[PDB]
Amino acid sequence: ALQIPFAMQMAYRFNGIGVTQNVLYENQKLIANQFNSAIGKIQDSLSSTA
Amino acid sequence: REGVFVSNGTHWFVTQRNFYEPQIITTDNTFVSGNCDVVIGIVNNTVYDPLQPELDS
Numbered sequence: 622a623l624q625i626p627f628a629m630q631m632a633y634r635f636n637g638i639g640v641t642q643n644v645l646y647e648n649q650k651l652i653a654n655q656f657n658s659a660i661g662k663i664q665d666s667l668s669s670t671a
Numbered sequence: 672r673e674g675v676f677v678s679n680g681t682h683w684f685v686t687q688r689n690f691y692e693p694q695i696i697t698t699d700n701t702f703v704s705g706n707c708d709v710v711i712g713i714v715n716n717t718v719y720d721p722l723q724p725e726l727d728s
C-alpha cells in the first residue's frame with residue numbers, strides 16, 4: 622500500500638474514466654457533498670426497508 | 672498531464688504514478704485550468720516554459 626491523499630486518488634479515478642483531473646478539483650466540495658449525501662441515502666434506504 | 676506532483680523536500684517535480692522518475696515541471700508536462708482559488712491544497716512553485724530561452728536567442 623502506497624499512501625496517496627484521497628482528493629488525489631479521486632483525481633486519478635476521474636482521469637481513469639476520461640474526465641480531466643481539474644473537473645474534480647474545481648468541484649471538490651460538490652463531489653464530496655454528493656458522495657456524503659449518497660452514503661446518507663444508502664443509510665436511509667437500508668434503515669427504511671429490508 | 673500524466674503522473675503526479677512530488678517534492679524531495681526542497682524542489683517540486685512531476686513523476687509517473689508507478690515508478691519514480693522526477694521530471695522538472697514545465698508547460699509541456701502540465702495543463703492549466705482556472706486560477707488558484709478553487710483548489711483545496713494547491714501549492715506555489717515555478718513552472719518552466721521551454722519556448723522562452725529558445726526565443727530569447
Ligand SMILES: *[C@@H]1O[C@H](CO)[C@@H](O[C@@H]2O[C@H](CO)[C@@H](O)[C@H](O)[C@H]2NC(C)=O)[C@H](O)[C@H]1NC(C)=O
Nearest residue numbers: 677678679680681682683684692693694695696
Ligand atoms: C531535490 O532535488 C534537486 C534536484 O535534483 C536537488 O538540487 C541539486 O542538489 C545538488 C547537490 O546539493 C546540487 O549540486 C545541484 O546544483 C542542485 N540543483 C538545483 C537545481 O538546485 C536537491 O539537492 C534535492 N533536495 C533534497 C532535499 O534532496
Ligand SMILES: *[C@@H]1O[C@H](CO)[C@@H](O[C@@H]2O[C@H](CO)[C@@H](O)[C@H](O)[C@H]2NC(C)=O)[C@H](O)[C@H]1NC(C)=O
Nearest residue numbers: 706707708709710711712713714715716717718
Ligand atoms: C502563493 O503565492 C501568492 C503570491 O504569489 C500568495 O498570495 C498573496 O497572499 C497574501 C496572504 O494571503 C496576500 O496578502 C497577498 O495579497 C497575495 N498576493 C497575491 C498576488 O495574490 C499566496 O498566499 C501563496 N499561497 C500559499 C498557499 O502560500
Ligand SMILES: *[C@@H]1O[C@H](CO)[C@@H](O)[C@H](O)[C@H]1NC(C)=O
Nearest residue numbers: 626627628710711712713714
Ligand atoms: C492538512 O491537515 C492538517 C491537519 O491534519 C492541517 O493542519 C493542514 O492545514 C491541512 N492542509 C491542507 C493543505 O489541507
